[PDB]
Amino acid sequence: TGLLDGKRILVSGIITDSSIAFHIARVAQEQGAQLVLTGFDRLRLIQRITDRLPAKAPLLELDVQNEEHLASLAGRVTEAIGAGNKLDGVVHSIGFMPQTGMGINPFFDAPYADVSKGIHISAYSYASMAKALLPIMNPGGSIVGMDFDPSRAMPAYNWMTVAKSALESVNRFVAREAGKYGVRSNLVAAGPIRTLLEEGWDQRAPIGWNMKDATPVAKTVCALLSDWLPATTGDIIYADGGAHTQLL
Amino acid sequence: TGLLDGKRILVSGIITDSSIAFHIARVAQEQGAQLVLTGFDRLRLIQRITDRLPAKAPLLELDVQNEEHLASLAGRVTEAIGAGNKLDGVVHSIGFMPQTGMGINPFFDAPYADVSKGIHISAYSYASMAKALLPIMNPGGSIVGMDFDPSRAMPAYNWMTVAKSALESVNRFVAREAGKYGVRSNLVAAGPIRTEGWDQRAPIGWNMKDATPVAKTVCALLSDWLPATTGDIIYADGGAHTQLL
Amino acid sequence: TGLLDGKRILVSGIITDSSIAFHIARVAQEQGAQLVLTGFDRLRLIQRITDRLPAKAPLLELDVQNEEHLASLAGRVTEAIGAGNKLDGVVHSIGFMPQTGMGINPFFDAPYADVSKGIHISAYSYASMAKALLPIMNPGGSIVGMDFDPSRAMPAYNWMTVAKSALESVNRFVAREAGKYGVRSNLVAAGPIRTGALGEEAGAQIQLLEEGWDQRAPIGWNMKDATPVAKTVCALLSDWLPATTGDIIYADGGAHTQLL
Amino acid sequence: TGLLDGKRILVSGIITDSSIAFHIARVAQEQGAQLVLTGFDRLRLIQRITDRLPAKAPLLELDVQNEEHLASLAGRVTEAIGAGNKLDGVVHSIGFMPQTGMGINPFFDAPYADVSKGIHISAYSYASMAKALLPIMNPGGSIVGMDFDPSRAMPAYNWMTVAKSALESVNRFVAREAGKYGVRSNLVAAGPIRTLAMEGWDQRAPIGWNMKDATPVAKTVCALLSDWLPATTGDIIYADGGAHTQLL
């Protein structure tokens, strides 16, 4: 009997076998959660990657920028686990920022039309996903989305950082709204995962940080999807090896 | 002499006499500062507003959602202050958020498009004014923005907090760019300024019919008296954010 | 299985059956933990509270201002759990501050001697216990202490608020040390828990913090149930928050994340 | 003229001319304030150090660990500054922590008795000075303290960091009391400076940072003593070149 017995859990973000949405989904099922998976564009590719999970699940199409996808979303999830069954958990593990405002491109050279699409998919779609799903969730349930410490600036991360800071604010409001269903909303701020800054991360981490290992981040999302943190919401747990709390 | 003596400062945001920007300029001039100002929609009416500010200042047009105003800014300023002179300070007192994304209007019924218009103007616009004016700014310069503390969610402000949360991030990134020029970038988290509880939590009280202390603090950031603060946030809130109860 | 199975956890800070430490322990066992308890002063009276847990476990003396108690704690634990065995968890649920620096007493009227007793017991102890129990802990182990968000000033808490701020700083440092041993260090900030006797002002002021907490916490908050705090602590002691240390998890209904 | 013209202000912490208090005093005087100066032990050397200040100034004694120096503080100042008058500003720039609680000595080996003394001098004494000098403080006045960002652990600064976390907590509480007198209390969190015995900082700093130069800090402290940060209390202004706002 693992952490997630009898729990029906939605999981977005699976694109590659190296995705955090993958290791989270794999770990959930490894603990009893019966999963429902969602996918963005390459519907048939990620179908073949989900098949490599310990167990199979009703993968569903979900482009967060498409309004019809959200409207339908809820009722389609009902069809996959059977009507009169609701969701105990949901996982938002999605992000997107065009090269224009993220990476090597100067912070100033990023048009708003590029940034807004970055914030649409990475921040706003947290609320929108909650909106589409709360109605079909059970009390004592959990919504958990991916974060990356944005409280300070850095190279490359540029406007994605600004999207994460948008997310954090969005998390706190979704919590307000989510509380009416007896639902908790939290963010897991992870350390950098392969999918200077990383040689220093593992230094700063008092227990180390292995950027090739996404399992320690998944275990932490399962804890948030479990009943063992029933009094925390609108909040950020940090799975970065303790890096953020260490200057040098 | 004044605190902003012989520093040429740009001040946006003015729309009425209550307006944060209005008091900021007002004090800046009292502090011997030679100003430049920018206005948004009702340009014509806002000249009958800028008239009261002690001295005469060149009211240039600026719309942070308009790409052309931005490209022509440095040229429309450099000329206002005469070729050969650059700015020493920049003030962004600009915010907007459609009604659907605020107040009693549910959080989830805000269409992205409204929220997007709100981020562009309230958060992104800070980076775009910086891009436009860093090239014509002197070393020892200071850029400043108006912030409303978004660390915690609250009633009514809704997506504006999200725009404010985005704005604080952006600010840190503007500070990197401005560093290349020896120019600083900071926000001022103001308490309510009308355009009970706060007066309570605030150990020195708080008066939301009075914008001068907020206005004063924006002047300090423009001064040479905080030469080591950058990509940071100063609270002009009567210390309310520092008290639980 | 149980969430904490075959884990040898040392719990500290049980004085009455309302103690947070009593429910951390009560839950710990429901979830399979094998416990070693530490008690402070009235050592006889607390035996009679520990009896009434899910299961009887060894009570040990630990006056964390006694340097002798620390130098012998590790051997006394090892002895209680059997040679060859080591602790997998430690819980610091200890705190103290005189009426002088906490209550209706003016902030400026707490003589430094009292404050110092409070800081020793409420913050420094965390570094001592950690120092004493770390050499007998398995890699993967966990240390958690109880905290109460000192970020902002408030009425009454006064100098204990300062102790908590020092405790958070001491936590961050302890993490550095326990990491060598493969042990995580974390604190749990809990909303206020039932653990006008003071008077008109206090019975009101404090009646306002419990009116306010429920209000602000988006999933509400119950001043009478320490169970959700006990579950939070069990999740730090578990293998399901292994990437997190020197940090603070907030089991307070999410109230600290809301302004009103 | 000056920023602090004709303001009666006290300043503690001067032991050499490298001291942050010396440059806070120096600039305070370059701006036309009248100063009272306190000194811990080497009174005949802080004497000889202070001669070399823009204007001559009263140097009364004050070991903040002495109940009597504190008990007699208000009256000794009220004499130096003359009867009928009061202070407009107070500068706590005091801090100390035994060898044991810093540097190469292992964080676990500091006896509380050492930790305790350093918290007494660095953190607690701020409430004392506030307590001692507040009945002799005019409305619109201002208390300020020196801080080093203790929000994340680091090596070496060790137990002093715990003292600074405490001092910040103390700062917010001293503001409660200060407001009653119409006064503000604030810390200036400074970047490292070459003091008698006290890199990445100048790198992280968007505007860089020189640790042999304390003038930016004194300018900051003065800006808290001025009338130009009137809305700011219980808070912490960072004079560190934006360092803390960046990660790399």
Ligand SMILES: NC(=O)c1ccc[n+]([C@@H]2O[C@H](COP(=O)([O-])OP(=O)(O)OC[C@H]3O[C@@H](n4cnc5c(N)ncnc54)[C@H](O)[C@@H]3O)[C@@H](O)[C@H]2O)c1
């Ligand atoms: N990997 C890291 O180093 C790291 C660290 C901290 C946080 N994060 C965050 O974790 C989350 C997971 O990302 P990842 O690291 O696994 O990268 P990833 O590329 O594997 O996953 C990102 C996902 O976002 C999805 N996506 C993009 N646009 C979408 C849309 N319109 N609708 C639905 N889905 C869309 C992609 O399809 C993809 O599955 C992201 O939010 C990211 O910001 C990643």
Ligand SMILES: NC(=O)c1ccc[n+]([C@@H]2O[C@H](COP(=O)([O-])OP(=O)(O)OC[C@H]3O[C@@H](n4cnc5c(N)ncnc54)[C@H](O)[C@@H]3O)[C@@H](O)[C@H]2O)c1
């Ligand atoms: N009033 C407060 O309690 C308070 C508190 C903290 C922060 N602030 C911030 O201070 C700033 C100014 O607010 P205020 O209280 O002076 O109100 P205000 O009405 O006087 O100022 C708002 C300004 O936003 C400008 N604006 C909107 N859209 C624009 C666009 N497309 N292009 C250019 N300008 C545009 C308007 O012209 C106006 O000048 C805002 O950013 C606000 O968030 C206000």
Ligand SMILES: NC(=O)c1ccc[n+]([C@@H]2O[C@H](COP(=O)([O-])OP(=O)(O)OC[C@H]3O[C@@H](n4cnc5c(N)ncnc54)[C@H](O)[C@@H]3O)[C@@H](O)[C@H]2O)c1
């Ligand atoms: N009750 C709340 O709302 C609340 C909220 C947040 C945090 N906490 C924290 O939980 C912890 C325990 O609080 P509680 O509510 O269980 O109260 P409690 O009175 O039941 O526990 C305090 C414990 O400290 C122990 N103690 C005192 N002096 C000691 C000494 N020097 N050596 C060893 N132990 C000593 C006592 O024996 C007692 O068990 C404290 O750290 C407190 O700050 C309580």
Ligand SMILES: NC(=O)c1ccc[n+]([C@@H]2O[C@H](COP(=O)([O-])OP(=O)(O)OC[C@H]3O[C@@H](n4cnc5c(N)ncnc54)[C@H](O)[C@@H]3O)[C@@H](O)[C@H]2O)c1
């Ligand atoms: N230099 C830095 O890297 C740095 C950075 C941030 C903050 N600070 C802070 O600035 C403040 C002043 O230190 P500094 O950098 O000028 O170095 P410093 O050595 O020149 O100043 C230390 C002062 O503390 C005083 N002091 C010690 N015991 C005292 C006592 N019992 N009573 C009264 N005063 C006592 C000393 O007399 C001395 O004047 C300290 O609080 C320090 O922590 C320093």
